[PDB]
Design a protein around this ligand. Sequence first.
Ligand code: CHT
Ligand code: CHT
Ligand code: CHT
Ligand code: CHT
Ligand code: CHT
Ligand code: CHT
Ligand code: CHT
Ligand code: CL
Ligand code: CL
Length: 431
Amino acid sequence: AAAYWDGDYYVKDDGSKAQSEWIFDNYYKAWFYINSDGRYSQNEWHGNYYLKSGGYMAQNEWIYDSNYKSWFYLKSDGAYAHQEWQLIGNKWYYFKKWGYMAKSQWQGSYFLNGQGAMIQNEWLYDPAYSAYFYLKSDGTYANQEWQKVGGKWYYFKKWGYMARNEWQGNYYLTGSGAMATDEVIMDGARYIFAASGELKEKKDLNVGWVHRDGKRYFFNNREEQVGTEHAKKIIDISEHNGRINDWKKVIDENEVDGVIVRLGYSGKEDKELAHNIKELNRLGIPYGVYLYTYAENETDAENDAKQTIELIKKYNMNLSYPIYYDVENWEYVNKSKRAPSDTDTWVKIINKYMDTMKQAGYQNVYVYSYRSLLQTRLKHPDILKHVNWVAAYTNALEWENPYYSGEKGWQYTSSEYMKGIQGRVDVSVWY
Ligand SMILES: C[N+](C)(C)CCO
Ligand SMILES: C[N+](C)(C)CCO
Ligand SMILES: C[N+](C)(C)CCO
Ligand SMILES: C[N+](C)(C)CCO
Ligand SMILES: C[N+](C)(C)CCO
Ligand SMILES: C[N+](C)(C)CCO
Ligand SMILES: C[N+](C)(C)CCO
Ligand SMILES: [Cl-]
Ligand SMILES: [Cl-]
């Protein structure tokens, strides 16, 4: 025996201490870097190599470096992988310049997940491109082709963008991207598809707001009249519609009878509320208001009512339509919290909001929600008695409420285009 460790120092085959050099220890079967001070490197990098705790050079292994806040992979010769792909534990990883593992990002036509692994047979919504992509079996994005995914057909355009609300040859991609296999009503027409997706027939329809025999009516997509000649066209607006440049233009050109204006959501005022109220008041356009709730309990509900009342007085609101508690299956952007799923909690929440508003002197207060929620979570006599504005973007509402009787609204669309407004608009028929 000749060469040996002496504390932090290494004595070579001769009598001399190692200095500024790599040594291979046959006992450990490992490489070590000895520094200019004669001591082994550990828990640190030397050029392309990482020396682990105790000095051992990393080889064929992952290292997480807390200083760089990144994973690195040391190859068979110990050098860090960089600007290259590596197959490790039967998954593909990509290493960027300086060895940083790619994560939650594209590398050309491939996408690396939060763990660094190349994704395969997976949907990806990328906010950076504002669209859906599908990573195929080989990891590359679907491109200028059909893919059958989860038992349904989707079409991918140039650069991988999932087709939606559009045609591809004889096939129509619906809003979810899924190929139409039934019927689609659009363009004032009914499109009938084979179960296999090819268009079979188009039939023109009597639908929407129609002026007929000297009067105006609303027809649902089943070609059924909703209400009478006095049916009203009500839009609902928020900061999400942007700044409305010319309110009078919107009203006249689109024959709009009234507006429900977003107050905001629990704890925050809508950015366009001040402007919208100023203009609607100035022009004497009839309006009501709504608040999107993130309530979890009666305390939140009371706070919602307090907020509502504060805003009404602040902006001198003149309410021709009701105050609406907009109740949906809410979820925090960060997913930390979501709406209570039980009916009894919502009975408490909704009635606390109503009671608080009523005690404050506001007697024209109702609930808005979606048909699906009203059939399930919100299906209770003490909730339904307050519901007179229902959303269902369907061919007919086909929903009865035994607990409310009187004037009511059906929000039949969130995709209408109107003169004087940028982008899509929510519209209701009031009857
Ligand atoms: C491997 N060293 C000898 C350098 C340290 C472990 O005792
Ligand atoms: C090159 N080293 C000596 C640093 C180790 C094995 O490649
Ligand atoms: C691996 N890094 C390049 C990030 C540091 C070592 O030189
Ligand atoms: C170590 N990674 C998390 C980077 C990949 C292996 O699961
Ligand atoms: C290594 N690549 C990612 C380029 C191909 C594996 O499918
Ligand atoms: C999928 N895109 C082509 C749009 C970007 C990533 O390569
Ligand atoms: C594209 N998906 C099928 C994942 C849903 C779209 O909303
Ligand atoms: Cl390297
Ligand atoms: Cl619904």
